[PDB]
């Protein structure tokens, strides 16, 4: 029955990713005064299926002078880690109930940077290796603030257990006590996923190619699924972290409905932001992290270490 | 054909090599299977491959040549090679490791029988193995490419263009010409 549980998680994720491509093209469409896909199926509902079939029956070009082992490893690593990060999520009951679930999320997230690095190496292009180095430097910079921000929030929750964040917010959302941290967390999850205005590689098209410009067909599709699987997961993580839903043990479906709505709105906020702003220059988004976000995150880490002690509000360890 | 259309021109080429050929490209994808199986280690077969453009210019010159009506030609290359020393050259030009090993005729047909199950273009077949190892006939009594005003192109000149795509590095940095069976 546990193997049924795994499939009941993986398959819907790959369907949610499929229909996030439809919503992104229709929300961006209407925010640009047009309609988006509405011809392939009713209201475009079959568009993700057509795109899926199309990609997987196209030539999977691999340059002859590309390291085959790394060219294949990168999409497997990216998608494999993208699905792994979903297993500890309390929605409301985790598939795998980890005592250190939060630290597991960080640990797996930092491994995904390899797929960017391996793909750049395997291209043997040097129009993509620079893109990979720029992308990797961006990603590792912004997981510094994710860790310190996440550490600050856990000082009001008490543990790294993901389910304990539900108990912490049983009276009030953590966004009120920690709206300064939530703001930078939201931007930091935009830069980790290479989402606009932090998309210097995927779709910059400013004398800068993407690290996966050399991928075509199914292998490109796999990278796309990993990227979009992470967008939903990061926004589901934000809902649990700052917008905790009340959990009724007798009506657990009530939690899932409310928690599903919040995650969708946060995900649609990613689409909202892409339609509204230009993109940071690469050296500007490094100054955003090292000169603006990092000094403020450090100060709020000091403040959130001493605030429970000086208010006698230290959370329980269990 | 010679009876139905007596005035027809018949061209008999050896294995034709070129960018899209299945002759040099055939002795380069066998790397997918480790070593290179060759019946009798590829020593009892003599090959005289010809260039695609040479065969093409022969056909065109045969259209404008009134002397080609009701005539049979044999388009062959300028040099003769042993199947072993030609297959060695392909790997040398392609810069791929060369691990030849003999295989008996009955066993080589067995694996050819296996690849024939493919409902798509078979990678190899029993008939293909027979032709790869068949020695190219000498027909001195038939006009060649010299009677049509065509000079045969050595395989050495045009092997690099065919086998460039099989190499794994760009701007690697040479290979020696393959051994050739002298005439007579």
């Amino acid at each position: 029955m546990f193997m049924i549980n795994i499939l009941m998680l993986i398959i819907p994720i790959l369907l949610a990713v499929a229909f996030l491509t439809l919503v992104e093209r229709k929300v961006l469409g209407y925010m640009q005064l047009r309609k988006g896909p509405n011809v392939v199926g009713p209201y475009g509902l079959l568009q993700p299926i057509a795109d899926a079939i199309k990609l997987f029956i196209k030539e999977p070009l691999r340059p002859a002078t590309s390291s085959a082992s790394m060219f294949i490893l990168a999409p497997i690593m990216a998608l494999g880690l993208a699905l792994t990060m979903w297993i500890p999520l309390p929605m409301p009951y985790p598939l795998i109930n980890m005592n250190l679930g939060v630290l597991f999320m960080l640990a797996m997230s930092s491994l995904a940077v390899y797929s960017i690095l391996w793909s750049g190496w395997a291209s043997n292009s040097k129009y993509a290796l620079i893109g990979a180095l720029r992308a990797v430097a961006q990603t590792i910079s912004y997981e510094v603030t994710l860790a310190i921000i996440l550490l600050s929030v856990l000082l009001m929750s008490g543990s790294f257990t993901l389910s304990t964040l539900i108990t912490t917010q049983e009276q009030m959302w953590l966004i009120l006590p920690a709206w300064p941290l939530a703001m930078m967390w939201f931007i930091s999850t935009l830069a980790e996923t290479n989402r606009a205005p932090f998309d210097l590689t995927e779709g910059e098209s400013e004398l800068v190619s993407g690290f996966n410009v050399e991928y075509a067909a199914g292998p490109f599709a796999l990278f796309f699924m990993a990227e979009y699987a992470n967008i939903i997961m990061m926004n589901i993580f934000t809902a649990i972290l700052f917008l905790g839903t009340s959990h009724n043990p007798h009506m657990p479906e009530l939690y899932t409905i409310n928690f599903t709505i919040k995650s969708l709105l946060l995900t649609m906020s990613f689409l909202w932001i892409r339609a509204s702003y230009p993109r940071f220059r690469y050296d500007q988004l490094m100054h955003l992290l090292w000169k603006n976000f990092l000094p403020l995150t450090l100060a709020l880490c000091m403040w959130h270490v001493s605030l429970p002690i000086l208010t006698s509000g230290i959370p329980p360890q269990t | 054909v010679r009876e139905t259309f007596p005035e027809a021109t018949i061209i008999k080429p050896a294995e034709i090599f070129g960018r899209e050929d299945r002759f040099l490209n055939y002795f380069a994808n066998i790397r997918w299977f480790g070593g290179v199986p060759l019946i009798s280690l590829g020593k009892k077969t003599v090959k005289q491959p010809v260039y695609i453009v040479d065969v093409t210019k022969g056909i065109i010159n045969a259209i404008k040549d009134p002397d080609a009506r009701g005539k049979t030609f044999a388009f062959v290359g300028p040099s003769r090679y042993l199947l072993f020393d030609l297959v060695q050259y392909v790997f040398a030009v392609a810069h791929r490791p060369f691990l030849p090993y003999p295989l008996p005729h009955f066993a080589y047909r067995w694996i050819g029988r296996l690849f024939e199950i493919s409902p798509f273009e078979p990678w190899t077949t029993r008939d293909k193995v027979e032709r790869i190892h068949t020695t190219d006939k000498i027909l001195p009594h038939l006009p060649g490419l010299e009677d049509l005003g065509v000079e045969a192109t050595p395989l050495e000149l045009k092997a690099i263009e065919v086998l460039r795509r099989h190499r794994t590095y760009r701007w690697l940095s040479d290979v020696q010409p393959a051994k050739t069976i002298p005439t007579s």
């Binding site: 929300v27 469409g29 209407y30 925010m31 640009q32 005064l33 047009r34 309609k35 703001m183 909202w272 932001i273 339609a275 509204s276 702003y277 | -």
Partner: protein
């Protein structure tokens, strides 16, 4: 008369400095940009339902070519070769000779629709309204040869679009 676009001195009173600090820290003017795209999400899109709806055009539209006739069915063209002289792209080729009845008519009239720049000079030059650019703009082909029109194709277009070509000329000839 000139005006300055970016010549201003920001005020330096604590009220104004704190407003700019609030904008820097609270992202106020970025969220104001999110409100402009939120409004568009709740407007009616300008998309039309092509091919069931079509974009508006005027009687002056210059589309696919056609050779016209008089009401009797006689060709209007009298092989004067004015359209061939004025054609800035040299897309018109004409050969003519006396017809069996002695009239001045063309034996070749080709428009290379791949040299043509759809400029309308041929219908301005024509003194008998023979060569016109019709209202059709939906004649894309699958081959380059289908776009080398000869006299038969152009006379078929005229007999095909006369009902609509005649109406457009009726609505614009007073401006010509």
């Amino acid at each position: 008369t000139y005006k300055y676009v970016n010549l201003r001195e920001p005020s330096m009173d604590m009220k104004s400095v704190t407003d700019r600090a609030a904008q820097t820290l609270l992202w106020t003017e970025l969220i104001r940009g999110l409100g402009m795209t939120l409004s568009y999400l709740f407007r009616e899109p300008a998309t039309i339902n092509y091919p069931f709806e079509k974009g508006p055009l005027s009687p002056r539209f210059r589309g696919e070519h056609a050779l016209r006739r008089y009401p009797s069915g006689e060709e209007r063209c009298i092989a004067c070769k004015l359209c061939e002289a004025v054609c800035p792209a040299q897309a018109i080729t004409i050969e003519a000779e006396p017809r069996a009845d002695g009239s001045r008519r063309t034996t070749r009239y080709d428009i290379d629709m791949t040299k043509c720049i759809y400029c309308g000079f041929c219908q301005e030059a024509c003194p008998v309204d023979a060569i016109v650019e019709g209202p059709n703009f939906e004649f894309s082909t699958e081959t380059h040869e289908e776009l080398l029109y000869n006299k038969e194709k152009l006379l078929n277009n005229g007999d095909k679009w006369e009902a609509e070509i005649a109406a457009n000329i009726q609505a614009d000839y007073l401006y010509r």
